[PDB]
Amino acid sequence: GSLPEARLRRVVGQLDPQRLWSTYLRPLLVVRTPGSPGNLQVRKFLEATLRSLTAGWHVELDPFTASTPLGPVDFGNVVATLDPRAARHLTLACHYDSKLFPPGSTPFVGATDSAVPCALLLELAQALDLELSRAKKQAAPVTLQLLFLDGEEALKEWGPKDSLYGSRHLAQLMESIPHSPGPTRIQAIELFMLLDLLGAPNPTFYSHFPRTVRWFHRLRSIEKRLHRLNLLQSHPQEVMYFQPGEPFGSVEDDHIPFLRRGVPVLHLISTPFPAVWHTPADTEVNLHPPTVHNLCRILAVFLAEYLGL
């Protein structure tokens, strides 16, 4: 169920690293705390970019107001579903908000956390647009969904109530909406793959959920293959990212509200975290571009194999 070497090198060749970097990543690297103008502008940028894709995605916002330590705040999740008619979908997710820090420092823009995840999803959707479009026209049975969640980060301290505002809301919302066969939109998620903390040098990923280990093994195999095919940079050893064995640690994140409702999850998060995590140095200059593009190639092959593109 793997690509022939020919399909694979063509798929990798559809990626455009400058597009990823300049068209998708750079515009996100602004302060975008919930309720801010910057957050609103990034939301509108994601929406408009997704609506421009030629495949003709269904794009909708999930807006809500919630109580926070800062008083009422308005949040909005961006939900892009390629074929709303389809029974089920692979869902790829990330958070688009940036963590609020108090005034008086260099602004926190969360390059790894999660501007790079956001940009990867946009690049994958654009690079595979012709294949995705063809699949949707063929009424392919499993479509693609991209979620850009708001309010992942705590506004003032992490706990079950000041965190995950967007994902908690969206999971409850999906539970309340009928789908066919469903019976609700929660059952339409065939797999929930959450990208977080990506773009630093030397990431390490582990399988967080035995239920989904087969897909983790697929990612590891694709890393090894692309290494052997001379398609990964600054990758001097065949397995570097996808590590076998017990996880370093689990991480509370936007998958939790879905996991608790029985959705299968793969958590694609570096553990240990980037050295710059939750400091103002989590910026563009501290990203490692070759790693970002390595991950984009791994993910593009994964996506084409998962969906038969």
Ligand X SMILES: c1ccc(Cn2ccnc2)cc1
Long-range CB contacts (< 8 A, 24+ apart) of 125-129? 125/50, 125/53, 125/55, 125/57, 125/80, 126/16, 126/19, 126/24, 126/53, 127/11, 127/14, 127/15, 127/16, 127/300, 128/11, 128/14, 128/300, 128/303, 128/304, 128/309, 129/53, 129/54, 129/55
Where are the strands (E) in the chain, listed by range? 58-68, 71-81, 88-95, 142-149, 189-196, 265-269
Q: Count the site residues for ligand X by CB under 6 A.
A: 8
Q: Is 255 annotated as a binding residue?
A: no
* Catalytic option among 83, 129, 190, 196: 196
Task: Of 244, 247, 231, give the one whose Cα is nearest residue 298.
Answer: 231
Binding residue (CB under 6 A) for ligand X from 252, 275, 280, 308:
252
Active site residue 253: no
Q: Is residue 113 part of the contact set for Zn ion (CB under 5 A)?
A: yes
Least distance from C-beta 158 to ligand X, angstroms? Answer: 5
Binding residue (CB under 6 A) for ligand X from 197, 198, 219, 298:
197
Q: Is residue 158 part of the contact set for ligand X (CB under 6 A)?
A: yes
Query: Which is nearer to Zn ion, 108 or 206 (by Cβ)?
Result: 108
* Catalytic option among 83, 97, 129, 152: 152
- Which does residue 60 touch among ligand X, Zn ion, none (CB within 5 to 8 A, set by kind)? none
Q: Is 169 annotated as a binding residue?
A: no
Rg (CA), the chain: 18
Quickly count: other Cβ atoms within 10 Å of residue 307's Cβ. Answer: 18
Q: Is residue 150 part of the contact set for Zn ion (CB under 5 A)?
A: no
Least distance from C-beta 152 to Zn ion, angstroms? Answer: 7
Where are the strands (E) in 105-218, listed by range? 142-149, 189-196
| Site pattern 71..90 for ligand X (x: CB under 6 A) | --------------------
Quickly count: other Cβ atoms within 10 Å of residue 19's Cβ. Answer: 15
Binding residue (CB under 6 A) for ligand X from 47, 97, 113, 282:
113
Q: Count the site residues for Zn ion by CB under 5 A.
A: 1
- Which tokens belong to 200? 């630093």
Alpha carbon distance 273, 70 (integer Å): 27
By CB under 6 A, the residues from 232 to 251 that bind ligand X are 251
Least distance from C-beta 30 to ligand X, angstroms? Answer: 17
Q: Is 278 annotated as a binding residue?
A: yes
- Which tokens belong to 129? 């647009």
Angle between helices 289-307 and 5-14 (to 10 degrees): 130
| CB closest to Zn ion, residue no | 113
Active site residue 60: no
User: Which residue numbers are catalytic?
Assistant: 152, 196
Contacting positions for ligand X (CB under 6 A)? 113, 153, 158, 196-197, 251-253
Contacting positions for Zn ion (CB under 5 A)? 113
- Binding region: 113, 153, 278
